[PDB]
Design a protein around this ligand. Structure first.
Ligand SMILES: NC(=O)C1=CN([C@@H]2O[C@H](COP(=O)(O)OP(=O)(O)OC[C@H]3O[C@@H](n4cnc5c(N)ncnc54)[C@H](O)[C@@H]3O)[C@@H](O)[C@H]2O)C=CC1
Ligand SMILES: N[C@@H](CCC(=O)O)C(=O)O
Length: 277
């Protein structure tokens, strides 16, 4: 309540959470702070008009925060923990949202400046900008049951949230992590298609969007199985079971696996390649 939050990073994910948080009415524009190593107009300048506090020193950020978010490229993290670790008091919890980066590698490198650092590994996606982001997290070792709560609550204010045994955090990144981009790509497609049919552009994009959204809900607000909802929507005639067949004919499912697998396998590498060199 007397809480403040900071993003040692910036860019999208920062802006994402920051935007979601303010809107969710949990924090306050000014009661947040993100550091601008350089300043990327889009991101940075955006936050400015938003109301957040931006400083070139991802240090004042650490002092200004009760809850610290590590939102920087995975390989950058090291060049931070050993630049801020010293400034890591005990009051604050450190939530690293960087991909692949292990809770361990952070603690056992950050502890070198503190007996027991409080850290949690996060995994979110851009949709947080609304309240439909899908977030997963894992509690550190020096993380009290009162921290997961604060976490599981600060995030549940902007999307979905659940404790997850870190070893899973890598798959999750493929699915819900990258997912929003597999979607943005699939929408653009559909529009283009709907358009190659007579529908105007704006109109097409919105129907495509709406179509997806709706599908989501039905699936979430029930079990059924994505399999069955497919059945409920296709009359023996055609019009749909037909479109399916086409998708089904070009390994449409196959290609989505291929992309989650890829997202994962990559995230593994990025980290399991930062373990040594
Ligand atoms: N702070 C928030 O504003 C949150 C909103 N929601 C939302 O979800 C919406 C649709 O409804 P929900 O019933 O509230 O979404 P959804 O929580 O049911 O999102 C999907 C989640 O289904 C969970 N899952 C949920 N019920 C399950 C059962 N059996 C097995 N796995 C299950 C899964 O963990 C999965 O992460 C959207 O309206 C969106 O508002 C969900 C969490 C937080
Ligand atoms: N935390 C709520 C958010 C919203 C709603 O459905 O109204 C949920 O996912 O159940």
């Amino acid at each position: 309540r007397g809480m403040s939050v900071g993003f040692i990073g910036a860019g999208q994910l920062a802006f994402a959470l920051a935007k979601g948080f303010t809107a969710a009415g949990v924090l306050a524009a000014h009661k947040i702070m993100a550091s601008s190593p350089d300043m990327d107009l889009a991101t940075v300048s955006a936050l400015r008009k938003m109301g957040v506090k931006l400083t070139p020193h991802n240090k004042e950020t650490v002092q200004h925060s009760d809850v610290l978010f590590l939102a920087v490229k995975p390989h950058i993290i090291p060049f931070i923990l050993d630049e801020i670790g010293a400034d890591i008091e005990d009051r604050h919890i450190v939530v690293s949202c960087a991909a692949g980066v292990t809770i361990s590698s952070i603690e056992k490198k950050l502890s070198a400046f503190r007996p027991a650092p409080r850290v949690i590994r996060c995994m979110t996606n851009t949709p947080v900008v609304v309240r439909e982001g899908a977030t997963v997290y894992a509690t550190g070792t020096h993380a009290q049951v009162e921290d997961g709560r604060l976490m599981e609550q600060l995030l549940s204010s902007v999307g979905f949230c659940t404790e997850v045994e870190e070893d899973l955090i890598d798959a999750v990144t493929g699915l819900s992590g990258s997912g929003p981009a597999y979607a943005f790509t699939a929408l653009d497609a559909l529009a283009d298609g709907g358009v190659k049919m007579g529908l105007p552009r704006r109109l097409a994009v919105r129907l495509g969007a709406q179509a997806l959204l709706g599908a989501a809900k039905m699936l979430l607000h029930s079990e059924q199985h994505p399999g069955q909802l497919k059945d409920n929507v296709s009359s023996p005639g055609g019009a749909t079971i037909h479109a399916l067949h086409v998708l089904e004919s070009g390994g449409f499912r196959s290609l989505l696996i291929n992309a989650v697998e890829a997202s994962c396998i990559r995230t593994r590498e990025l980290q399991s390649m930062a373990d040594q060199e």
